[PDB]
Write a protein that binds this ligand. Sequence first.
Ligand SMILES: Nc1ncnc2c1ncn2[C@@H]1O[C@H](COP(=O)(O)O)[C@@H](OP(=O)(O)O)[C@H]1O
Ligand SMILES: O=[N+]([O-])c1ccc(O)cc1
Ligand SMILES: O=[N+]([O-])c1ccc(O)cc1
Length: 288
Amino acid sequence: SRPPLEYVKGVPLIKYFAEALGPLQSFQARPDDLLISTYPKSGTTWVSQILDMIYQGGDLEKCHRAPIFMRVPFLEFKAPGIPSGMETLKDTPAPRLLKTHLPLALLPQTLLDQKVKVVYVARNAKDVAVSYYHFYHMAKVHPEPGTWDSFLEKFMVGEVSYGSWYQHVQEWWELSRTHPVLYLFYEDMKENPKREIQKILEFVGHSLPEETVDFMVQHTSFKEMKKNPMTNYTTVPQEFMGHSISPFMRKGMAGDWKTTFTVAQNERFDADYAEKMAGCSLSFRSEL
Ligand SMILES: Nc1ncnc2c1ncn2[C@@H]1O[C@H](COP(=O)(O)O)[C@@H](OP(=O)(O)O)[C@H]1O
Ligand SMILES: O=[N+]([O-])c1ccc(O)cc1
Ligand SMILES: O=[N+]([O-])c1ccc(O)cc1
């Protein structure tokens, strides 16, 4: 019933995920692992499904084996009456696709040392905040969200599960200068998914015929993913995720934060964002 966050090295975390970090210290990466890394609500499930269809040669018979959360072990995950990501990892064959939201301050150092390829997805802060707010309501391991205005204040000082968005997107953007990281944007995927799939294909070093890429484009669109039981999280216990409170596949839009942010909230957020992202080669689009 909505436990408080726990701080581990400056990072606020779901308490079961904090507990999960102990067993995870004995995780050993493989030169052929591939890590999907995002701040929450930035496109994790979307890119996981794309990467997993690439892994199965574009066939969809093969992606229905089990849910996405079984096919792509979530490193730090754990919950009551649900297998930890470390547990699920035991039964995952190489080459493995792995998922995390851990800041670099917590990331198993084995992944950097083994030079593990990373697919990093970033999304504009305002859509992430709105998506995160609704997520808190359905995903019951999170503390109480509160009102949207108070949730928004928490999001700006990084007092939410996994801490600061502004730091996450910046530190992984720096990492990409020195480590194999394909650094993607949710808004790009939204604008031209085929182009982004072709980018992911080239990073993992596969080629596919164009028909298979079109097939993948269709089967990873918001509407297909919303109705697919394997990707929409409807198979987990109600005590864990309340689908009738807010579906995991909620809207899938770039730019709809405008229907949630008030004008005062926007002005404050914009002033704060400019202090935080002061210098940056890194930039985001709020809208298409
Ligand atoms: N194939 C797809 N196309 C566009 N957005 C999708 C997507 N699959 C899921 N998403 C969206 O991405 C979000 C969740 O990201 P994550 O998988 O990292 O938790 C949600 O955003 P919204 O709440 O804005 O709808 C969700 O609806
Ligand atoms: O990541 N998740 O939300 C999960 C992960 C694994 C599981 O068995 C159920 C849900
Ligand atoms: O709290 N949860 O159950 C979560 C949190 C993050 C995520 O990527 C999936 C599941």
